[PDB]
User: Fold Double-stranded RNA-specific adenosine deaminase from Homo sapiens.
Amino acid sequence: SHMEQRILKFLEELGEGKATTAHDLSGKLGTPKKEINRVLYSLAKKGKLQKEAGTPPLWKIAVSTQ
Amino acid sequence: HMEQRILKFLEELGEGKATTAHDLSGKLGTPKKEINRVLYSLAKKGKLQKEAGTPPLWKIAVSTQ
Amino acid sequence: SHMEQRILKFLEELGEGKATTAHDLSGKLGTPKKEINRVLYSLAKKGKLQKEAGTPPLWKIAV
Amino acid sequence: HMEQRILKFTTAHDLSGKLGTPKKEINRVLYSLAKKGKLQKEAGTPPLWKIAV
DNA sequence: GTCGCGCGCAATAAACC
DNA sequence: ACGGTTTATCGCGCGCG
Assistant:
C-alpha cells in the first residue's frame, strides 16, 4: 500500500503547516477520492495526520500528539 | 459506451424488477461514481426512471401517457 | 441558530402560506447561496421547514 | 411512526430488539433526532445514546 | 461489527445578464 | 484581437467492507 507514502510525501512538499482538501489530493495524485478519504481517515487514526474542522475537511501532517 | 452497458444490463432483469447503483458497480466492474453519474443522466434524458429511496432503485423508464 | 432565525423570520414576514427560493433568500440577506442552502436543508431535516422539489426548490414554514 | 415510538422507550444495537427494528432504521432516527437536539451521542464502541434533558 | 450514507457534484455544460 | 459569473435537486461533511 504505497498510497499512504505518496500522500504524506505530498503534504511534506506542500510546505510547513500547510493543509489541503481530499478533492485536491484526488486531482493531483490521480487517485479516486474514495480511496483517498479511506486512507486520510486512516492516517489520522494512526496519529500521523490531523484533521482541521471544515467542509470539506482540511488535512495536514500532525504535529502535536505522540 | 458506458450508458448502453447499463441499459443492456437492465434488460436482462425482467420488466418490473429494479437494482441499485452499488449492485451495478460490482457487476459491470465500474466505480460507483461513474455509475451514478450515468444513471442520473439517463433518467434526465427520459431513458430511465428513478425510484428514490435508501439506496435509490433504478429501472427502465415506464411510460405514463 | 442566528442565520436560521434570519431565514425563519423572513419566511414568516413573507406570506403565511407563501414560499421562496434559496436565490431569493440570498439577495435579500446579503448571504451567498451556499450558506443559505446549508441552513435551508438543515432546517428540513429538523422538520422546521417544508421543501418543494423543483428548479429551484421552494421552501416554506412547516407545522 | 418510528420517530414517535423511539422517544417513549442504550445502543442502537440494543434498540433493535426492544422494538424489533433493523439497526439501519434505528441509527437513522437516532442521528436525525440528535440533529433535532433531543438526543446526544456518547463515544462508545458501538456508540451510546441517551435523551438530552 | 463504529455505519447514520441518500452522493451523481465537475478535470462541467448550460444559462444567465 | 476575448463573454465573466451563476446555475444544476448543487445542500456534499462520505471514508462504509
In short: Chains D and A do not touch (no CB pair under 8 Å). Chain D has one domain: 1-53.
